[PDB]
Coordinates of N, CA, C and O and ligand atoms in Angstrom, one line a residue:
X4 N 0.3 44.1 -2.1 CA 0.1 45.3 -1.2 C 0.2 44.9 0.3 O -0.4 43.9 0.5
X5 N 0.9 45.6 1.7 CA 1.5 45.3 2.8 C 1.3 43.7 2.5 O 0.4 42.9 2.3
X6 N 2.9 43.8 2.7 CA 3.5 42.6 3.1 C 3.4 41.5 1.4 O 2.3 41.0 1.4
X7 N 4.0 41.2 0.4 CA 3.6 40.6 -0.9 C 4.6 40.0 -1.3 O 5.1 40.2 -2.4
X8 N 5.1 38.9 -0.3 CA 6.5 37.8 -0.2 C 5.7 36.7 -1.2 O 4.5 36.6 -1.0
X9 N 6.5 36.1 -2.1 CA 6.4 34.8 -3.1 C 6.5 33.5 -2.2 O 7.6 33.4 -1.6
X10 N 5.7 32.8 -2.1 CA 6.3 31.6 -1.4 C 6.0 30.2 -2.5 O 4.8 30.0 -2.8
X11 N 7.2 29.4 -3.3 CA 6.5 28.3 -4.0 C 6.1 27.0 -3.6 O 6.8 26.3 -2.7
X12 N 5.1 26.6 -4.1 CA 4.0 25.6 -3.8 C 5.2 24.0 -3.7 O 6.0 23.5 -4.5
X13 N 4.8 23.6 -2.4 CA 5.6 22.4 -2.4 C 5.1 20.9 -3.0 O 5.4 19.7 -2.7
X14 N 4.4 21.3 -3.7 CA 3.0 20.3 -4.2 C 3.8 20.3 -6.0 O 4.5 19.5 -6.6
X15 N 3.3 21.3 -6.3 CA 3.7 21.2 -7.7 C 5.0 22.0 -8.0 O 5.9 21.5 -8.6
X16 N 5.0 23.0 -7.5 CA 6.3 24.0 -7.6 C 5.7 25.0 -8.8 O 5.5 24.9 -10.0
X17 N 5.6 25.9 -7.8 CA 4.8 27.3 -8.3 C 4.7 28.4 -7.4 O 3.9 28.6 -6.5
X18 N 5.7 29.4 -8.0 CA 5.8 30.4 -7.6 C 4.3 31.7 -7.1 O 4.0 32.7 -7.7
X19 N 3.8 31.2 -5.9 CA 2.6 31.5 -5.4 C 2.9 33.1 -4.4 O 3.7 33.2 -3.5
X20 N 2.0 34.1 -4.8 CA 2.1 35.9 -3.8 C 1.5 35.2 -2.8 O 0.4 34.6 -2.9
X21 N 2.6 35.3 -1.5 CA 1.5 35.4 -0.4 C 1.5 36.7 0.5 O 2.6 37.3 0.4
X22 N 0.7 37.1 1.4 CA 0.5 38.6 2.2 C -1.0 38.8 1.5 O -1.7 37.9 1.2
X23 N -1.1 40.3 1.4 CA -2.4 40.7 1.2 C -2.3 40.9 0.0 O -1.4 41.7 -0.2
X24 N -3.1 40.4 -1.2 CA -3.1 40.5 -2.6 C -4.0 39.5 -3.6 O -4.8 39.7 -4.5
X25 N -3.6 38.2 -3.0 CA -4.1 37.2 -3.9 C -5.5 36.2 -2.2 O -5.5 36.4 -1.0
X26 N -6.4 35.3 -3.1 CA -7.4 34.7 -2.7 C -6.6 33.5 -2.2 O -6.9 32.9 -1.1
X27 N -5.5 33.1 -3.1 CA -5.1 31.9 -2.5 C -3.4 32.0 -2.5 O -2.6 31.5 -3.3
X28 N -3.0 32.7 -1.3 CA -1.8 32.7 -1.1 C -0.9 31.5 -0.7 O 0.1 31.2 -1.3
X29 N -1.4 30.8 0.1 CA -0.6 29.3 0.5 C -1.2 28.7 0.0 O -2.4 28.4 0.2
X30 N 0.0 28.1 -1.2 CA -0.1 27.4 -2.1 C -0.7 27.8 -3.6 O -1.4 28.8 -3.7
X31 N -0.6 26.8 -4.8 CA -1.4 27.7 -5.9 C -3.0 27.4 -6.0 O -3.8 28.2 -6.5
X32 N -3.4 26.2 -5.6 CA -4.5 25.7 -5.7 C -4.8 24.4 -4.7 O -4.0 23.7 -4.3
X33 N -6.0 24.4 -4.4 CA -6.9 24.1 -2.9 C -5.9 22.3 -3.1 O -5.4 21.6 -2.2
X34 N -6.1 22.3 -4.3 CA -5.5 20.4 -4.7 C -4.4 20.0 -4.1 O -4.6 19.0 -3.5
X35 N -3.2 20.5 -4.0 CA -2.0 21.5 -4.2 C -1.5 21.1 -2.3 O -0.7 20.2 -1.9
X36 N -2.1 22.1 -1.8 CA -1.9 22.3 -0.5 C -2.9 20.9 0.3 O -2.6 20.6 1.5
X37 N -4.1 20.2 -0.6 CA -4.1 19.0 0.0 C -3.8 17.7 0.1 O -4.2 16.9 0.9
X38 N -2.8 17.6 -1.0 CA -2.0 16.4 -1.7 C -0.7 16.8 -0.7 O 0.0 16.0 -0.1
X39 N -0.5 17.9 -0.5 CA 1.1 18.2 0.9 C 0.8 17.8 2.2 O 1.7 17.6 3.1
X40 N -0.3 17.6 2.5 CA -0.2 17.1 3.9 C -0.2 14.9 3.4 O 0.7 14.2 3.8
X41 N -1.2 14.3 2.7 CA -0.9 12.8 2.3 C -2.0 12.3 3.0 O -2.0 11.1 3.3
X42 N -2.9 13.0 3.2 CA -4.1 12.1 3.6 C -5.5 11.9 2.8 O -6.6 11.9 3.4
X43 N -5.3 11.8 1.8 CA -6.1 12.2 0.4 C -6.1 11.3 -0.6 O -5.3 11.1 -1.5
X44 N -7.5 10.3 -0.3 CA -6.9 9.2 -1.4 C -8.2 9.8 -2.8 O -8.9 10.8 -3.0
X45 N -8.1 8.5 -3.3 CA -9.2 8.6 -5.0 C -10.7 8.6 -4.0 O -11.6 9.3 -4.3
X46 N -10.9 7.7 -2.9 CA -12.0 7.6 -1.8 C -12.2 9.0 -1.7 O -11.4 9.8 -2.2
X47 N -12.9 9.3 -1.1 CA -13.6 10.8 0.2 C -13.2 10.2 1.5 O -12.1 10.5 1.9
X48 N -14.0 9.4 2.4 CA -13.2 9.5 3.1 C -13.7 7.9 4.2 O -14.5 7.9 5.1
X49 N -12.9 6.8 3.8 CA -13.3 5.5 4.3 C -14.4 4.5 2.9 O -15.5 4.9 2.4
X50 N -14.2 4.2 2.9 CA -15.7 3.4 1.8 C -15.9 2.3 2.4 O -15.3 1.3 2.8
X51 N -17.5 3.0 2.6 CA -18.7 2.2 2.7 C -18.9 1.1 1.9 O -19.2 0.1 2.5
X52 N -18.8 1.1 0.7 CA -19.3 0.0 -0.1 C -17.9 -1.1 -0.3 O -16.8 -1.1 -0.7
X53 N -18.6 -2.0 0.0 CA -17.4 -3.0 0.2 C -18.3 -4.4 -0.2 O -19.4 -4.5 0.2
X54 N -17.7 -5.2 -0.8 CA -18.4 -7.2 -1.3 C -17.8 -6.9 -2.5 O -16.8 -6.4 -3.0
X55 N -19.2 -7.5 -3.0 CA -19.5 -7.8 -4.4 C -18.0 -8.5 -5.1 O -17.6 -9.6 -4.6
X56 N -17.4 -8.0 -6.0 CA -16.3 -9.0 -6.5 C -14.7 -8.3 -6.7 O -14.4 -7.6 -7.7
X57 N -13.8 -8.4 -5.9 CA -12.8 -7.6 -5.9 C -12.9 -6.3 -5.7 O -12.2 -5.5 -6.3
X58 N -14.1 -5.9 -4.6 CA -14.6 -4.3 -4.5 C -13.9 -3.6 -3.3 O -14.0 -4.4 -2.3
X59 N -13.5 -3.0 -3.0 CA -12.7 -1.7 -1.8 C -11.4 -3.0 -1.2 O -11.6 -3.9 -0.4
X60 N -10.1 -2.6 -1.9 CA -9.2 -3.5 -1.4 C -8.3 -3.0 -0.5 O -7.2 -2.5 -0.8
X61 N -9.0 -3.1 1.3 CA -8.1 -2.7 2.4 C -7.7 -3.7 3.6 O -6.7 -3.6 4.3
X62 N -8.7 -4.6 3.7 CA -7.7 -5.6 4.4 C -9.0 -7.0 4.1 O -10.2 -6.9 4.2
X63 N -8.2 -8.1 3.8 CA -8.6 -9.3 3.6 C -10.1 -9.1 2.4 O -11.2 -8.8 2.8
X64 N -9.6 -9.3 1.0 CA -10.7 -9.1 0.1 C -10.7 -10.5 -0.4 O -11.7 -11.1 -0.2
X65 N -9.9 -11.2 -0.9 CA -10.2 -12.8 -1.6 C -11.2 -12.7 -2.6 O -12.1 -12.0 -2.7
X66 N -10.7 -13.8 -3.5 CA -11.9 -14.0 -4.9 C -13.1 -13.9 -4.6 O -14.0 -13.4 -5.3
X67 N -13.1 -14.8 -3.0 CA -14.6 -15.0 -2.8 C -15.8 -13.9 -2.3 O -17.0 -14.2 -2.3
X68 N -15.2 -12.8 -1.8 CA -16.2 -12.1 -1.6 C -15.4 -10.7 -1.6 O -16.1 -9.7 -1.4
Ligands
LIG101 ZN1 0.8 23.8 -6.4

């Protein structure tokens, strides 16, 4: 209803209503539209927890710590 153009999800490819109609017009789901921009890892956001034995591997980890 006003304005109800399809735009598909560049993420998965999924033919998504956008205009006034649907809750989640850009894109099909929240996952979706944040995996398209690439700044999204398995982390949240930086990790804290780092030693112990082959733990958080981002720069210089070694056997030894
Ligand atoms: Zn999608």
């Amino acid at each position: 209803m006003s304005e109800t153009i399809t735009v598909n999800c560049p993420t998965c490819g999924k033919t998504v209503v956008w205009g006034e109609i649907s809750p989640f017009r850009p894109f099909c789901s929240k996952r979706c539209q944040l995996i398209d921009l690439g700044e999204w890892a398995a982390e949240e956001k930086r990790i804290p927890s780092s030693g112990d034995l082959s733990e958080s591997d981002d720069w210089s980890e070694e056997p030894k710590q």
